[PDB]
């Protein structure tokens, strides 16, 4: 056979129990003799030692503890298949291990209180300010790092409830109604939220304090 | 080479864009020969058709749409390597595709209101009732389907505030303090929550209405 072996992918933060089986290594030369399996590489016999191991006679590749993609995202190991002798019956097997992402991190606003301001006179649709939240998880290939922005509430509610809105992706807060008026209401506190999985995940909260100018 | 090909794991609910590369199929007989690649299997050339595909010359296995583990958890496909001359140059390659779980589902109480009852005289630690919330995601291999239960609030708060507890995993509501008395308080309404990723995920909410008997 001359197929190139593909990588295996292992989701991070797996549930117990450990150790657990990933895949079974096997040379088909064991229709002939007994075979002894082993592994090498960082993650196995060099730092970080003992993250993976293999059952010498079964060939089972074992993971000994939960992985964290944000700590190490990939491993490069090698499977070795030996006879009673000690002598190779295969060239070593490429064991590329890709740690795939889970939503093990909540999103975080870059500050607890954002300040901005706007002229009472501006047209509906004008930008006021921009808020940011970060999420350590993969936002490129998965939604676990993708933040959706929302306004939870506005104090005060004068002259009404919906003076501002927020762009769900960019975090840019804009004016959406007439009626801003410094003399009447000089300042608003907006309770803002960021939610991962583009809305379907967990939510964290902060405020944006918007000063009205004339 | 005679190592057995491992399965590849593809996380579900992948983010755009598509198609996107999974792994590159390759026969090292391409030192000798011009190779044409193809794949067959359900998910490829039979229902559901065209979920996967392969680039004829590069050998890249492609995914053409986001997978959903709770729809199809696993695919079994075959890769073929054919020479310009028409010869099949390998035994077809086993392409086992494991669709690994993401947290694409919120926990759901099996009903909005649970009704139970208990005698006023019972000892601390007596069971009252059991409430259930389900989660379509994997709870064997991941925390995404693992529900943690909690009591948000007890109304009313006579005589005490922590009259009941709820078991974190089972959803069994227990009495934990003396002082129950139907003539003083005939009913409690417990606001109860179920939260996936074993409490670090999304929350949902329902009511346990507990009748007190004498
Ligand atoms: Ca996240
Ligand atoms: Ca993560
Ligand atoms: Ca879930
Ligand atoms: Ca799922
Ligand atoms: Ni071979
Ligand atoms: Ni972390």
Curated annotation (Swiss-Prot), chains A, B:
UniProt subcellular location: Cell membrane
Residue ranges of domain Cadherin in the record: 2-109, 110-214
Tissues/organs with expression: Expressed in some normal epithelial tissues and in some carcinoma cell lines.
Glycosylation positions in this chain: 94
Function according to Swiss-Prot or TrEMBL: Cadherins are calcium-dependent cell adhesion proteins. They preferentially interact with themselves in a homophilic manner in connecting cells; cadherins may thus contribute to the sorting of heterogeneous cell types.
Comment block on domains: Three calcium ions are usually bound at the interface of each cadherin domain and rigidify the connections, imparting a strong curvature to the full-length ectodomain.
Subunit description: Interacts with CDCP1 and CTNNB1.
Disease field: Hypotrichosis congenital with juvenile macular dystrophy: A disorder characterized by congenital hypotrichosis, early hair loss, and severe degenerative changes of the retinal macula that culminate in blindness during the second to third decade of life.
Protein name: Cadherin-3
Covered residues, full protein: 108 to 320 of 829
